[PDB]
Amino acid sequence: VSIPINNAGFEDPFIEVVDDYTVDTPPGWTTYNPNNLVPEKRTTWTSNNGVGYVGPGTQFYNQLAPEGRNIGFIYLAQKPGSGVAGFEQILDATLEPDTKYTLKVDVGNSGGEFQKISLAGFPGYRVELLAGDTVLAADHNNLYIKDGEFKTSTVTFTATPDNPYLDQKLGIRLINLLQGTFSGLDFDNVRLTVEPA
Amino acid sequence: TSVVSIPINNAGFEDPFIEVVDDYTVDTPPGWTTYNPNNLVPEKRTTWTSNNGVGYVGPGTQFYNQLAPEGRNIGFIYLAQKPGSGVAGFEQILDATLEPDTKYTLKVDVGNSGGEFQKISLAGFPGYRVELLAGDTVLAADHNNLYIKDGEFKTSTVTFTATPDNPYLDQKLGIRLINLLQGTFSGLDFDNVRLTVEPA
């Protein structure tokens, strides 16, 4: 049983040309920006985020997008250690007790080169499940993902009747840790499902 | 060229020895420092201030349906402030340093103490985070990924692969075991810290 998420596979907007991309916050999401690394007005080369089309002929991946045409990316131009940024979405569903939540997202390490800049290397990722502003459970960079590949991160959480955050809105964050270069990474196919526990 | 254990001081909190079952210290365990980024833990502690220490979990224990995962003792962190006030726990910087083409495996048992202490319910859990460090950088971490019932321990596992281009190679490895203070009762236990390295 799914909890609906807006633009969960970053398929909005449609992108016609393979490897073309946007540099603005994907519809349905907000830019998680606790260290002000990402500017309000972006270019190709500022710190930015957006969606990109991974299809046949892609120069960056050894497979198609995990879901549909598009993935969501986050690029950070500041040096490693400067902070983090990413995607955030607050949901209408609220944290309920005796319920087990399962968050899954695919995490992508883009390979290849862009404007003769090597994409080799990875910044590290964090996937967060939130109630309000509280990170209930999170995968802080537990998966090793090679250049050009995707892997699925899974975060689960069970709320007890005594949890302090019951009735707050559930949220998701997909974070670029900026702990290495090349300092971009991708996400796709966000899924949140729920079951009695 | 094979799986090797990296030495950790007082890795099962067996120092100091504690004679009486369910008795405990309230000072930083030997070999570890108090991780205190939000200054929640005072330098001088009593039972009901924020604190940390070691505790003997043996036959007779009121807090678990099992004995200590390893040896006699566990290490604990208790926080008196309200949920949301910050985090605290244990930190230990190791002599070993981050090496390329290696896979690190950090394991620690996380305990959710149950029962009653001084008529206070130990029901509930603050949440935990287990961190593998190089220098000041959290390379990988288990932020509360296991559901742990009152009265049991579960093993948390954190893995990390260091590449030749990792920016933190040759920095000293570290371990943090953290009370998240995201619930009450706001205490939790750790035991049996293990770190291995192997060719990736």
Ligand SMILES: [Ca+2]
């Ligand atoms: Ca997609």
Ligand SMILES: [Ca+2]
């Ligand atoms: Ca890459």
Ligand SMILES: [Ca+2]
């Ligand atoms: Ca995949």
Ligand SMILES: [Ca+2]
């Ligand atoms: Ca022990």
Ligand SMILES: [Ca+2]
């Ligand atoms: Ca408990």
